[PDB]
Amino acid sequence: KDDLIAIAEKSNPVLKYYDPLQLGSTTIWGETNSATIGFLRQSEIKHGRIAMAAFVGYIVQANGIHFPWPMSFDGTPFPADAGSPPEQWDALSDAAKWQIILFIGFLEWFSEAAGKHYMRGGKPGAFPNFSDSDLIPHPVPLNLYDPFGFSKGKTEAQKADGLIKELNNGRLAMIGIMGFLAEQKVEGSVPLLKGVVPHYDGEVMAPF
Amino acid sequence: ISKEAILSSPDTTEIGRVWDPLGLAEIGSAETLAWYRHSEVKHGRIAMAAFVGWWAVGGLEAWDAVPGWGKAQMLLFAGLIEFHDELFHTRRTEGGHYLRGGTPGKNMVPGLFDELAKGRDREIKNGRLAMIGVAGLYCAATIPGSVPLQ
Amino acid sequence: EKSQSLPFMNRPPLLDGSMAGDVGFDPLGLSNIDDVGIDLYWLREAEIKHCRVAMLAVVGILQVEIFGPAPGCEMATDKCQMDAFWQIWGAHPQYIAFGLIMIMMIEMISGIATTQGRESGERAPGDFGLDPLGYGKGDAAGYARLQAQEIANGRLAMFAAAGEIMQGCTTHQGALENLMTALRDNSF
Amino acid sequence: KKSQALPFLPYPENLAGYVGDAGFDPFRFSDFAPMDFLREAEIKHGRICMLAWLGFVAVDLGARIYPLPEAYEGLTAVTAHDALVQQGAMSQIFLWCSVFEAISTVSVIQMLYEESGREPGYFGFDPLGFLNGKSEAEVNEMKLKEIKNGRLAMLAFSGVVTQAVLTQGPFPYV
Numbered sequence: 001k002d003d004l005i006a007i008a009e010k011s012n013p014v015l016k017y018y019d020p021l022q023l024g025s026t027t028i029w030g031e032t033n034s035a036t037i038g039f040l041r042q043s044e045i046k047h048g049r050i051a052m053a054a055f056v057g058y059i060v061q062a063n064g065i066h067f068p069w070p071m072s073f074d075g076t077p078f079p080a081d082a083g084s085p086p087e088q089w090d091a092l093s094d095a096a097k098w099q100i101i102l103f104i105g106f107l108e109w110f111s112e113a114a115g116k117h118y119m120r121g122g123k124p125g126a127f128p129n130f131s132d133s134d135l136i137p138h139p140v141p142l143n144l145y146d147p148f149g150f151s152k153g154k155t156e157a158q159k160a161d162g163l164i165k166e167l168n169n170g171r172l173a174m175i176g177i178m179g180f181l182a183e184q185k186v187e188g189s190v191p192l193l194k195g196v197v198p199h200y201d202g203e204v205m206a207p208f
Numbered sequence: 209i210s211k212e213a214i215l216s217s218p219d220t221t222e223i224g225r226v227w228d229p230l231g232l233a234e235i236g237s238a239e240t241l242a243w244y245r246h247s248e249v250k251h252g253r254i255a256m257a258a259f260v261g262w263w264a265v266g267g268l269e270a271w272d273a274v275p276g277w278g279k280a281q282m283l284l285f286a287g288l289i290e291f292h293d294e295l296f297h298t299r300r301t302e303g304g305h306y307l308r309g310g311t312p313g314k315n316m317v318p319g320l321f322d323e324l325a326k327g328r329d330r331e332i333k334n335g336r337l338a339m340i341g342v343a344g345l346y347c348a349a350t351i352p353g354s355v356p357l358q
Numbered sequence: 359e360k361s362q363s364l365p366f367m368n369r370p371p372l373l374d375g376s377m378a379g380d381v382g383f384d385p386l387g388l389s390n391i392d393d394v395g396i397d398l399y400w401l402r403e404a405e406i407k408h409c410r411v412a413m414l415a416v417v418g419i420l421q422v423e424i425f426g427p428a429p430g431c432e433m434a435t436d437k438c439q440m441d442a443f444w445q446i447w448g449a450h451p452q453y454i455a456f457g458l459i460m461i462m463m464i465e466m467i468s469g470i471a472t473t474q475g476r477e478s479g480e481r482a483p484g485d486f487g488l489d490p491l492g493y494g495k496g497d498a499a500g501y502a503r504l505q506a507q508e509i510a511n512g513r514l515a516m517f518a519a520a521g522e523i524m525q526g527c528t529t530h531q532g533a534l535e536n537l538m539t540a541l542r543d544n545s546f
Numbered sequence: 547k548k549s550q551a552l553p554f555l556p557y558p559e560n561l562a563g564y565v566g567d568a569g570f571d572p573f574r575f576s577d578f579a580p581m582d583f584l585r586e587a588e589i590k591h592g593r594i595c596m597l598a599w600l601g602f603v604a605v606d607l608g609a610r611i612y613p614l615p616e617a618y619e620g621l622t623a624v625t626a627h628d629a630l631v632q633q634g635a636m637s638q639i640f641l642w643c644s645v646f647e648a649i650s651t652v653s654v655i656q657m658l659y660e661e662s663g664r665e666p667g668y669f670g671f672d673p674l675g676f677l678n679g680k681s682e683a684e685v686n687e688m689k690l691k692e693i694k695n696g697r698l699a700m701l702a703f704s705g706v707v708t709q710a711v712l713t714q715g716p717f718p719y720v
């Protein structure tokens with residue numbers, strides 16, 4: 001709580017600490033206030049990290065970027081022949097969707113089980129490396145955060161500033177990817193994206 | 209066998225802790241938790257064999273073709289196993305019965321069975337998935353249709 | 359000292375909160391009976407037996423009206439269990455008479471255990487030593503909770519089993535479709 | 547205290563010593579009758595039903611005596627009683643049972659009231675030479691096997707003669 005004010009002051013020196021609902025002073029599962037404030041930090045970082053891969057992933061999959069080679073046993077390439085990327089998630093398969101969801105579900109699992117948790121001694125958003133923690137029996141070559149090692153040697157003050165521009169680029173891409181999908185179901189919902197977005201008009205908030 | 213010696217098997221890695229939402233290991237005694245452990249592995253080792261028999265003949269119609277003599281023969285055959293299971297648990301054990309002093313998984317009948325505590329943690333987990341696999345093959349196959357949907 | 363359940367009445371003197379479901383609810387003073395082979399021991403054994411019989415009778419109705427009769431008894435086909443008894447008696451009456459004499463030997467032995475357990479002091483009322491899983495060995499606070507949960511579910515099931523007899527013998531339908539009938543009749 | 551078969555009941559103390567003891571006398575027949583009279587009656591009831599179950603299921607499995615008399619023909623184990631009261635077979639066996647039971651009446655009275663020291667169920671019958679100098683713990687496990695197979699046969703015969711009348715069918719109910 002004392003460090004959450006110190007984080008948001010560095011994200012904006014005008015808007016120091018913004019909380020209309022005062023959600024930062026609640027508990028959820030009866031842990032304590034300081035443990036759920038690491039839950040709220042993790043969930044904000046995870047929401048922004050997903051949305052910022054979703055924004056790049058939108059503009060790649062909205063234009064015609066179908067890369068060879070199609071990895072299937074019959075044919076059936078990446079279904080960019082609609083195009084309109086909320087339509088193109090529907091046209092994968094039904095059985096290909098469980099492979100995407102359960103693979104992310106391991107990384108959701110491994111961020112909870114391994115080295116140290118955000119509802120404890122914290123550092124939320126820090127994905128534990130696959131080299132340690134002794135739970136996976138393969139072992140795998142690379143890690144999720146630094147597979148090629150770029151860039152170890154950066155000081156603490158160089159990486160403390162990184163999450164603060166990850167939180168601000170994460171907050172904007174939450175607004176960014178949702179402004180695309182709002183025009184996929186109601187037009188005129190964002191004023192400056194009229195005509196660009198092709199009105200998917202189904203249900204974006206359902207997989208199957 | 210105490211309570212903490214029962215809940216040390218299997219490992220609690222894939223959930224994170226011992227998974228008891230209803231608190232059923234805390235109500236009773238250490239004799240009661242040993243009955244919970246013995247009946248898990250007996251439920252598991254039966255549903256492991258009963259799962260692949262659905263695929264070794266592939267279900268509900270195959271049991272109806274068994275005669276009244278054939279149903280009565282194999283059911284009391286496993287009864288004399290489970291009679292002499294608890295019997296050899298009592299008299300031919302260095303500790304005694306599994307609710308008194310014995311191992312709840314050791315299943316003492318000679319001849320039905322033929323680094324191992326590692327296999328004790330693997331028998332339960334490979335058995336646990338069979339019981340939800342068998343209860344799938346009774347529900348996802350037979351009673352309604354669109355259960356899994358696999 | 360006043361009763362908890364009836365705070366305008368004095369507490370009944372033989373009820374002191376030692377038994378499981380004791381909140382002093384004896385307005386008629388029936389726990390003070392000590393004459394015609396009947397005392398507080400006999401009434402507690404009668405309460406506990408009425409508890410356990412009615413508890414089994416409720417799930418014994420709800421098993422057949424949901425999942426059907428047992429195999430070998432598929433001749434029932436009626437959701438009214440007061441009528442489904444007479445189809446099992448019509449075809450396989452020997453198993454009911456097997457159970458009724460097996461109850462007769464069990465109940466006559468339980469009647470001796472009640473009156474010998476009352477004259478001596480080595481038997482609690484309703485106690486048969488049937489704790490094979492062994493819940494009574496440890497955590498006496500958690501064991502007194504099970505003694506209270508037996509009484510609390512048993513006193514509730516007494517109304518339920520008496521109701522399912524009476525609203526089965528008067529509507530001739532079955533308990534769960536008496537419940538659906540009442541839901542559509544008194545919906546607002 | 548605390549009878550084994552009925553742990554919610556106190557121990558009937560007249561059962562102590564006898565060999566089929568599970569603490570099972572809830573009706574307290576031992577407090578009315580002497581236990582030598584009851585054990586002699588338990589053993590004799592058991593020895594009859596061991597023979598009676600085996601003789602019932604052998605006649606219904608088709609085993610007959612050879613040469614079979616012409617009045618013995620066309621009989622199952624149910625109808626064999628009433629047909630052979632007429633022939634005289636049942637009167638013959640009742641004669642030799644009454645010969646034995648009249649001498650056993652002298653033995654039962656002398657066991658109960660003249661103090662012979664005779665074990666209940668003892669008739670001295672061991673031609674094959676069991677219990678040959680064996681210990682008291684070895685004659686007691688053999689006495690327990692007679693009573694439990696005796697006790698089992700009484701319920702076993704009671705099934706096989708009730709189910710025979712209810713079906714009048716092939717072997718495993720007659």
Ligand code: CLA
Pocket residue numbers: 257258260261262264265270271274282320321
């Ligand atoms: C364990 C549950 C189970 C049950 C109740 C059944 C029941 C049935 N099976 Mg099936 N079956 C099973 C599992 C089971 N099976 C397994 C695990 C296999 C692979 C071996 C089979 C392979 C099989 C075939 C090929 C056929 C049947 C058939 C039948 C039907 C009648 C004949 C019979 O009784 O088979 C006898 C019982 C068995 C073969 C199962 C024995 C299971 C063993 C004893 C488990 C223990 C093994 C243990 C690891 C080592 C012990 C070794 C020792 C026994 C020597 C009957 C409905 C017949 C049928 O009518 O199909 C429609 C038929 O043709 N079964």
Ligand code: CLA
Pocket residue numbers: 411412414415417418419421422426427428429431434442443446453454456457460461464486
């Ligand atoms: C009040 C208790 C009670 C009574 C009177 C009945 C009566 C009946 N049931 Mg029901 N049933 C009950 C409870 C009861 N059930 C329970 C608790 C369940 C499990 C939820 C069921 C599940 C069930 C099914 C699935 C079916 C029945 C069926 C039947 C009918 C024929 C069965 C029969 O006659 O067996 C004969 C009796 C015996 C074989 C023995 C009885 C038990 C003995 C006496 C031991 C009792 C021990 C006691 C409980 C505890 C110890 C006492 C002491 C030591 C302290 C019969 C009317 C069948 C039917 O026809 O439905 C229409 C049928 O398919 N019952």
Ligand code: CLA
Pocket residue numbers: 514516517518519520521522524525528529535536537539540
């Ligand atoms: C164990 C408890 C119990 C229960 C739940 C039932 C339930 C029922 N009985 Mg049975 N019955 C019982 C015991 C029971 N009985 C006993 C002990 C006997 C005597 C032996 C009977 C004899 C009997 C007969 C003869 C008959 C029934 C019938 C019925 C049904 C009638 C509907 C009814 O009156 O519900 C009870 C109604 C309520 C409890 C009202 C609900 C009150 C609400 C929840 C209060 C909330 C108000 C809230 C505070 C206000 C704010 C809201 C507002 C602002 C909108 C119903 C299923 C009849 C039937 O079978 O119908 C088909 C029938 O003919 N019963």
Ligand code: CLA
Pocket residue numbers: 594595596597598599600601602604605609610611618619621622623626627630635636639673
């Ligand atoms: C409870 C005792 C008992 C009674 C009252 C009966 C009564 C009957 N049996 Mg017998 N039966 C019995 C036991 C009994 N059985 C036993 C234990 C066996 C197996 C050996 C048989 C085998 C048998 C056959 C094969 C036949 C009968 C038949 C009959 C009927 C005709 C009369 C007869 O004596 O046949 C003959 C009796 C026997 C062959 C049995 C002999 C008695 C046995 C061996 C007991 C003696 C044991 C004793 C220790 C031996 C003494 C040894 C010592 C001297 C050294 C009659 C209803 C006949 C029948 O039903 O025709 C329609 C018939 O054909 N029974």
Ligand SMILES: CC(=O)O[C@H]1CC(C)(C)C(=C=C/C(C)=C/C=C/C(C)=C/C=C/C=C(C)/C=C/C=C(/C)C(=O)C[C@@]23O[C@]2(C)C[C@@H](O)CC3(C)C)[C@](C)(O)C1
Pocket residue numbers: 052053055056150151162168169170172173175176177179180190191192193
């Ligand atoms: C007034 C109005 O109506 O507005 C309209 C108009 C308009 C503008 C269209 C709108 C919009 C959409 C917007 C603004 C969307 C913004 C989306 C946003 C903000 C997306 C961030 C992506 C960053 C990514 C994906 C990757 C980082 C990837 C990496 C690998 C790193 O950062 C690692 C790194 O840091 C370290 C760790 C170490 C160093 O070695 C350096 C590097 C860099 C390698 C609206 C609001 O909808 C409606």
Ligand SMILES: CC(=O)O[C@H]1CC(C)(C)C(=C=C/C(C)=C/C=C/C(C)=C/C=C/C=C(C)/C=C/C=C(\C)C(=O)C[C@@]23O[C@]2(C)C[C@@H](O)CC3(C)C)[C@](C)(O)C1
Pocket residue numbers: 019020021
């Ligand atoms: C930290 C933060 O930022 O959050 C904080 C701060 C913040 C932002 C200030 C908040 C706020 C304030 C908010 C959201 C205020 C909004 C209030 C609201 C939504 C007020 C609706 C009035 C509608 C009326 C009276 C309709 C009459 C309609 C009548 C009488 C009709 O006849 C209806 C009609 O259909 C019929 C029935 C019949 C037709 O013949 C006629 C029509 C068609 C007309 C939050 C969210 O609370 C908390």
Ligand SMILES: CC(=O)O[C@H]1CC(C)(C)C(=C=C/C(C)=C/C=C/C(C)=C/C=C/C=C(C)/C=C/C=C(\C)C(=O)C[C@@]23O[C@]2(C)C[C@@H](O)CC3(C)C)[C@](C)(O)C1
Pocket residue numbers: 018019020021047048050051053054055057058061085086088089173174175177178
């Ligand atoms: C006046 C005032 O006080 O305001 C206050 C009010 C209030 C409410 C109290 C406060 C707050 C909290 C706020 C505003 C919370 C809103 C957060 C927001 C807007 C969160 C969306 C995240 C998007 C996600 C997680 C996923 C995208 C999903 C992606 C990227 C994908 O899955 C893939 C996909 O896209 C592609 C890549 C490819 C396609 O083939 C398929 C699809 C389409 C599926 C503030 C901050 O105090 C401000």
Ligand code: KC1
Pocket residue numbers: 288289292317318319320322
């Ligand atoms: C029904 C309950 C049951 C009992 C009570 C029992 C008892 C004994 N069995 Mg076992 N048995 C089964 C069941 C039972 N067996 C079953 C279902 C199978 C699979 C077909 C099986 C297989 C074998 C094999 C291959 C051998 C074997 C033996 C023994 C022997 C020594 C005990 C020991 O091994 O320590 C004792 C008497 C060995 C042997 O024959 O010794 C002379 C031996 O080589 N059994």
